[PDB]
């Protein structure tokens, strides 16, 4: 078939794990004696057919269904008023359903009772076994919403008493009635009334999730520029973290309930700062700690100028920077977006602490000096490995001067060089250059330099070694050739 | 289904069109564009979309009617006072509220012990008992009548509650 809805169950394999402890305890002989029967042929199943025919009635609106409505209306009109039934004809079915659920008892099938505890237990076991992961998740959701309140409020004595009622055995019920402790401690309905408040809170949380998730998901997926998580949380009253987690959970369940692998970039995109903070790997038995400050430095409340500098930096800084803001405008291609946000995202965010529009530096190449040996030695310098050389000496290797020493604009850079295994001479990439200094593990997710204030407070004001340096850079081909240089005077054309 | 070199390549099987993911992708595709959604931006430098009126207009333009037309209908987990108290002490009560693939479960261990269902339910019972003591002392409002509580009701007071509106014990007392 192709539907395999709850009426005709998908056939299942044998040797499958049983949902309940007594069925983990099944003897294999009795397991085998079990017969493969439809769901409705179960005594409890057949009684539930008797119960659910009314659920069919409310929709399948046949002439027979109208006749059954008439009969059930007549039966329900046993109420003295009758007017309530008249107005509730559209929902008299739920009254009969509630009363039918109440009037269910366990005994012998051949006797006047519909089904026994064993049949009910078997139906539960196999109904659970017949559930996919989605079905099991929905069952656990139902448990959370319905049973946890009542179960939390109820005492263990009350639960054992309800177990005795389910077993419906007169002898054990009589023993419990004999027991004094069981009689006295059951009657606390005023206390039990807290159960509806507990249920209401759990249900309002589940309602937040399942109903307010799709709406804000649609808004954020449509225009994350218009409705980013902070605005979304502020205008819906929820938490920043709760809204972000709702979005992540909804996308991941949409991926998981289908058979599409989720995009792991979403938690990284919505939790960039938290991803850098809290997502370390750990080993066994080491009880790692938490670092509160990145570095040890003087606080900014200690000076008027530090306070002003921090205030200016905060005003120039974001508060929550997202995958759409200016700092990420350098991800101009979808492949750049995917490679930056999918994997090596930690590498990319760690390549530089500050936030810029590059995440790196362009590479370039150098010319190889003429080898007067010629092709006798052109084979050299080609190897199996990249050879990296970093300069040292005075004027190089100082941590305090790191940002100035590996700045492309500095006449005195550190001059790193890489020889490729094919003999090519190239410059170093920003990460290779940065790997020759002391480690620097921190990031700044909110300061974006281009939005600094200007023109109110920030209004910046103002030997022949420079000539000698320009001479050094200047080409010197004129030495071989006020006798000013002129274009050639053509002779062949005359 | 053909690469540059011309040979055949593996194509993932199409996802079921009835899936929520398929609906989401389809809805993103044929719905209206972002730049056609609003013609003018907010009055004060800010993009339109904060107020529930603009939000609802945008949602309708996108082809979906909000179940939360006004700020009063959306729930607010700040008001709940018992769920946070129970959550803070021993753990989450709505275990499986944030579950995926059957993982990330926060339920007690199945091995009956100092970390199992009996102890966890006993401690939750203690916390709700503390809140009920608050109710009795009058700091908290009296809870409404519940089905579990209604299920006992002397076996005769259920009839009175049913014949009356009887949402609260105060209402039943007035009745």
């Amino acid at each position: 078939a192709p539907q395999w809805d709850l009426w005709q169950s998908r056939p299942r394999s044998e040797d499958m794990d049983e949902a309940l402890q007594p069925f983990m305890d099944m003897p294999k002989s009795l397991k085998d004696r079990r017969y493969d029967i439809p769901w409705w042929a179960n005594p409890f199943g057949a009684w539930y057919l008797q119960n659910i025919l009314s659920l069919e009635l409310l929709k399948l609106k046949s002439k027979t269904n109208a006749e059954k409505i008439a009969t059930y209306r007549s039966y329900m009109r046993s109420l003295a008023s009758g007017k309530d039934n008249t107005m509730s004809d559209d929902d008299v079915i739920r009254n009969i359903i509630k009363e039918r659920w109440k009037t269910l008892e366990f005994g012998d099938r051949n006797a006047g009772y519909p089904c026994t505890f064993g049949d009910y237990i078997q139906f539960l076991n196999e109904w659970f076994k017949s559930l996919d992961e989605e079905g099991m998740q929905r069952l656990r959701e139902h448990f959370d919403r319905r049973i946890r309140p009542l179960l939390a409020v109820m005492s263990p004595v009350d639960i054992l008493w309800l177990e005795a009622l389910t077993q419906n055995s007169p002898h054990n019920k009589e023993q419990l009635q004999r027991k004094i402790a069981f009689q006295t401690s059951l009657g606390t309905p005023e206390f039990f009334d807290m159960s509806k408040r507990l249920r209401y809170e759990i249900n309002e949380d589940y309602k937040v999730r399942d109903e307010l998730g799709p709406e804000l998901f649609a808004l954020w997926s449509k225009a994350p520029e218009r409705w980013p998580p902070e605005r979304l949380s502020k205008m819906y009253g929820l938490d920043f973290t709760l809204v972000r987690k709702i979005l992540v959970w909804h996308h991941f369940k949409a991926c998981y309930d289908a058979c599409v692998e989720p995009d792991w970039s979403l938690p990284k995109r919505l939790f960039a700062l938290e991803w850098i903070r809290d997502v370390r790997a750990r080993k066994h038995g080491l009880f790692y700690g938490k670092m509160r400050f990145a570095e040890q430095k003087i606080t900014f409340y200690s000076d008027r100028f530090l306070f002003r500098d921090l205030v200016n930096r905060r005003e120039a800084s974001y508060a929550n920077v997202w995958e759409m803001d200016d700092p990420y405008r350098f991800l101009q291609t979808e492949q750049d977006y995917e490679d930056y946000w999918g994997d090596n995202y930690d590498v990319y965010r760690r390549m530089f602490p500050e936030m810029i529009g590059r995440t790196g530096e362009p590479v370039q190449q150098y010319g190889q000096m003429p080898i007067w040996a010629g092709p006798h030695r052109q084979h050299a310098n080609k190897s199996e490995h990249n050879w990296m050389f970093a300069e040292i000496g005075v004027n190089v290797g100082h941590e305090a001067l790191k940002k100035l020493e590996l700045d492309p604009t500095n006449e005195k850079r550190r001059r790193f060089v890489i020889r490729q295994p094919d003999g090519t001479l190239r410059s170093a990439k920003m990460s290779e250059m940065r790997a020759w200094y002391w480690k620097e593990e921190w990031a700044d997710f909110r300061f974006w330099a281009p939005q600094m204030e200007w023109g109110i407070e920030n209004t910046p004001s103002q030997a022949d070694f420079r000539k000698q340096r320009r001479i050094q850079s200047r080409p010197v081909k004129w030495f071989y050739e006020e006798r000013e240089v002129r274009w050639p005077d053509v002779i062949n054309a005359a | 289904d053909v690469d540059a070199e011309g040979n055949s390549i593996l194509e993932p099987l199409a996802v079921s069109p009835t899936s929520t993911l398929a609906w989401w992708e389809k809805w993103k595709r044929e719905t209206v564009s972002k730049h056609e959604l609003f013609t003018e931006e907010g009055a004060d430098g800010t993009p339109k979309g904060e107020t529930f009126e603009e939000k609802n207009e945008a949602l309708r333009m996108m082809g979906i009617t909000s179940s939360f037309q006004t700020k009063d209908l959306v729930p607010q987990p700040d008001r709940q006072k018992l769920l946070p108290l129970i959550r803070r002490e021993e753990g989450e009560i709505a275990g499986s509220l944030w579950a995926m693939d059957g993982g990330e479960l926060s339920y007690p261990k199945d091995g009956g012990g100092p970390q199992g269902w009996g102890v966890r339910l006993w401690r939750e019972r203690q916390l709700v008992k503390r809140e009920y003591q608050k109710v009795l002392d009058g700091y908290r409002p009296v809870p409404q009548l519940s089905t579990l509580g209604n299920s006992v009701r002397t076996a005769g007071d259920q009839l009175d509650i049913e014949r009356s509106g009887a949402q609260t014990p105060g209402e039943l007392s007035d009745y």
């Binding site: 794990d17 539960l124 319905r146 009542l150 639960i159 009622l165 | 339920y107």
Partner: peptide, 28 residues
């Protein structure tokens, strides 16, 4: 070894319909 939470299911063997009045059905 991760537990499969079979006590969830064991808690369903009780007759919650007696108290909840159709607790297994949709919420009203």
């Amino acid at each position: 070894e991760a537990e499969k939470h079979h006590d969830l299911h064991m808690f369903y063997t009780l007759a919650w319909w007696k108290l909840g009045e159709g607790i297994f059905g949709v919420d009203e």
